Amino acid sequence: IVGGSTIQPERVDAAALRQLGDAMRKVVGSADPTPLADLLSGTPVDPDELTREVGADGRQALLDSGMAVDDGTTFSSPLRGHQLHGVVVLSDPDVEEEVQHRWYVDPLWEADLLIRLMLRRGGARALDMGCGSGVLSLVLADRYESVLGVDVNPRAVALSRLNAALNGLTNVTFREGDMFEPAEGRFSRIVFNSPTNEEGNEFVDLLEAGEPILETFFRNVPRKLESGGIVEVNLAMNDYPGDPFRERLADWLGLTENGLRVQIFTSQRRATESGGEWKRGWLVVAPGPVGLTEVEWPYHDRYEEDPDALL
Ligand SMILES: CN[C@@H]1[C@@H](O)[C@@H](O[C@@H]2[C@@H](O)[C@H](O[C@H]3O[C@H](CO)[C@@H](O)[C@H](O)[C@H]3N)[C@@H](N)C[C@H]2N)OC[C@]1(C)O
Numbered sequence: 001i002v003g004g005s006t007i008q009p010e011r012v013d014a015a016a017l018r019q020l021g022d023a024m025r026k027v028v029g030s031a032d033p034t035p036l037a038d039l040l041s042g043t044p045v046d047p048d049e050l051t052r053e054v055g056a057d058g059r060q061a062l063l064d065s066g067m068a069v070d071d072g073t074t075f076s077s078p079l080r081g082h083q084l085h086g087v088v089v090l091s092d093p094d095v096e097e098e099v100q101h102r103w104y105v106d107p108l109w110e111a112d113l114l115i116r117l118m119l120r121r122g123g124a125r126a127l128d129m130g131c132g133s134g135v136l137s138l139v140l141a142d143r144y145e146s147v148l149g150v151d152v153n154p155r156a157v158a159l160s161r162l163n164a165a166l167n168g169l170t171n172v173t174f175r176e177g178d179m180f181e182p183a184e185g186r187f188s189r190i191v192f193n194s195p196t197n198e199e200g201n202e203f204v205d206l207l208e209a210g211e212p213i214l215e216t217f218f219r220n221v222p223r224k225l226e227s228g229g230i231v232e233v234n235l236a237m238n239d240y241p242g243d244p245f246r247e248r249l250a251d252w253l254g255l256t257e258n259g260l261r262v263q264i265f266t267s268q269r270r271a272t273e274s275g276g277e278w279k280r281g282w283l284v285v286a287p288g289p290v291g292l293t294e295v296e297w298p299y300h301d302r303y304e305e306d307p308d309a310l311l
């Protein structure tokens, strides 16, 4: 029921979308919301006051793109607006798992934290695997010559395209497909906010896809990464007695065979039923001495006390 709305940025001229994006820049994320900020907060709004804020040509762009729905008396939006790290972003509202459509898009559960963890370097060509709303691609666009975002959710591809247009970003491309199959060539930068959490090995849905999605990602990383490239992954990791995640990870990447260096920064951990362990952390592949290192970095705790310990 949440996450199935039609999103059609192709039905709106890019100049009209850029203007809606500039209007969002003024009001989204600011106290004392205007009608447009009310609309993109999930509050029904009077179409006339909307029109006075975005014009008569913005109101129809809201409708043609799917950003807004005509209820007759009011306008309402299935999407919610954010402004962070120099971009405006629409995504689905944060709702419980039981009311999520199969094409529900990550409502930015961790995006703001992950952007602060990301290395601040730029480079030639970046890949956003599982791009969702497109948020990570939009931020990378400001320091990469081109960015490709990939998602198997076609609604996320459409939302990403819409968010790119709202921001007037022209060096970002999005493609529908399964993992690396639409990503041709090599990349200097690969980011993956992985759909893994509490499901262990089980595929539950596109947002909890099981460890096999990590195995496919890491097995194919070495042939997609430019030499000297950087990979950054948000992931949940399961250690089992006699079978720690890090050993499987070393096998998937071919650490020695491909000459790669990996660092795992573990932020949260808990004992599990098997006598093993669940962990959430941040994994970086970056040039340096071959092998694997794991360190404790409670960045969730630090984020909650002060978002400023970037890196
Ligand atoms: C893309 N990666 C992500 C990953 O970051 C990570 O996100 C979780 C996120 O699910 C958790 O939301 C959960 O609680 C919310 C509020 O109570 C509910 O409203 C959500 O419905 C519910 N799911 C969040 N509390 C803590 C995040 N760390 O697991 C999923 C992922 C899709 O795989």
Ligand SMILES: Nc1ncnc2c1ncn2[C@@H]1O[C@H](CSCC[C@H](N)C(=O)O)[C@@H](O)[C@H]1O
Pocket: 105, 106, 108, 109, 110, 111, 129, 130, 131, 132, 133, 134, 135, 136, 150, 151, 152, 153, 156, 177, 178, 179, 193, 194, 195, 206, 207, 209, 213
């Ligand atoms: N086989 C697959 N290939 C490509 N993308 C996949 C996939 N399985 C799941 N995904 C996508 O992985 C994404 C994880 S959600 C992360 C969204 C975004 N990067 C953000 O940080 O908010 C989802 O959009 C999901 O549809």
Ligand SMILES: [Mg+2]
Pocket: 097, 100, 204, 205, 207, 208
């Ligand atoms: Mg789910």
